[model samples]
Target: ISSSFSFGGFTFKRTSGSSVKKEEEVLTGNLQTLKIRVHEGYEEFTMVGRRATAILRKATRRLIQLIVSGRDEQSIAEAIIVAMVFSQEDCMIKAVRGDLNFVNRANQRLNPMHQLLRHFQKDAKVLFQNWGIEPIDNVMGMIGILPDMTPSTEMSLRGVRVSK
Candidate 1:
């Protein structure tokens, strides 16, 4: 029953900086603002509200700032994925599998809050259960073994999400 009408979208604003022709390297030629948004219907697509990816996005930038604060200088991270989970009894999530692991490495420190929440659920559930939280996989909607969901979002509709 995990099949349904799920959608994603994004309209990009391309930026230019230098004249270079190499589509394989992470060049400083241009910066793109893949401005993200969510759908009007907030039912079967996510765990949070319409702004689900929005919060995670801010938290992601914050993650860098957090590391940066301990950086050579200083600056500004889901901050709410946890609450978002419990608040919705049957919490479900939708995300890019690539987003789950930075560089396809399983233990990157830059992993999403949703991923870590899965970690806590798998190993730390009993500890939280002592706090009265049930361990019924409240952390929902992530792909663990297969790449079935990635191919679903084609075109440029990759980041902006319409939720559940």
Candidate 2:
């Protein structure tokens, strides 16, 4: 049996036994600290409920995973931005499959995720650079394709679309 619930904006799943017991403990501490910092910076929207917590969880986890996997710091920071902006429910799965998309729907302009991404971008880049990691050209290229979604934008660009 398994159960899922939204906590601090991130969805958490718990099953019969604790397969990830040890990892969970470490993750919990790290997540708590991150939640505090993120909430302090964007309290109004971020503290509203589950969505903000979820985005934070996803971004932090992805950042830690990237670092663990030996990815460069800049790539990890870029991944954090990607995680915040394109947080589909199945984000990890899509990310693993190389199908992450950033374009939001027209009605999603005021979404907390989008707002967070916009607010975090400049600071995130500078923070990474301060840590001695230069920005990756490919990561910048990837971000360049993300168009700001508005009612006037094409529907084809709003969601995931396959190209021939």
Candidate 3:
């Protein structure tokens, strides 16, 4: 009911289900990279490879940019960054909880990407605190505003595959 393949410096896994297949590649400039794999319909069921989150972050940004352009944009310049951030956050939430709508809520506020980059940093911090992990430096290493993904060099070291 599924198949896995690697191409273009990315590893992809597809499964038959009502949900969507998400892929992320972490690490850079290597023949083999870390990848994230998961079922389309399951929450909190993540398969993270070393650096997989990094790659996922990159792909998510691109996806968001596409969505923003397709929707509405007062300025292509502004839309580019917004779309990228939205896409990256969505990817992270979906990885943790198959549904993004239920990841974080506190009345009125809906969709973690609502407040753009602000809410993202705040939310990620709270979530990390809840998990007892140290907070990341900032989102995307931006000075005044936050983007997506932690700027910390901390990388995941899971889901490594080996072969002879």
Candidate 4:
């Protein structure tokens, strides 16, 4: 049973130059290879997916939603790992890209994680009915953990205080 969100990351190297400074560079095509690992770790899937939603655990503090896409190389990796952290009922698998054709068929033989994905999304309204939102797609990556915002502590001080 997979108990943690650390879903075993591999290496990401540039196929071209080392100077490619954006995530979109790697994601050249319209499709993004979203991977969710389930079933003993030997299996994998590569469907086109997107970053869609984030449900914060803080109405209990701070409550917060394509959750649309990427940041730096390192934090992006961390986000995906921690974000995929769910209390799986012994589950694991890849999500591929945000692909669908009714079932939003991301192209797999139908894994258990997808089943969970189905429940979370279809029934997401129960958890989200009052929140006034719902997941646009399955939680594939971590970039959407903050909706359209990415967390950064580095503040820019370019403004001047006019008040004396």
| Candidate 1 whole-model C-alpha lDDT, 0 to 1 | 0.22
Residue-by-residue lDDT tens digits, candidate 2, 29-54: 11221111221111111112211221
Would you list the C-alpha lDDT of every candidate in the order shown?
A: 0.22, 0.27, 0.29, 0.25
For 25-93, candidate 3 gives per-residue lDDT tens digits of 533112223343422442211112223321222232323112111111122213323333334433333
lDDT-best of 1 and 3: 3
List the candidates' TM-scores in order: 0.18, 0.23, 0.21, 0.20
Model 3, TM vs. native = 0.21
lDDT of 2 at 83: 40
Write the residue-wise lDDT of candidate 1 on 26-95 in tens digits. 1111231112222121222222223332222212111100000111100000212232322221112221
lDDT ranking from best candidate downward = 3, 2, 4, 1
**Where in model 1 is the C-alpha error above 4 Å?**
1-42, 45-107, 127-164
- 1 or 2, which is superior by lDDT? 2
Error of 4 at 114 (Å): 4.7
Clashes of 4: 19
Alpha carbon lDDT at 19, candidate 3:
47
Clashing pairs in model 1? 9-157, 39-162, 43-164, 45-164, 46-164, 59-77, 62-77
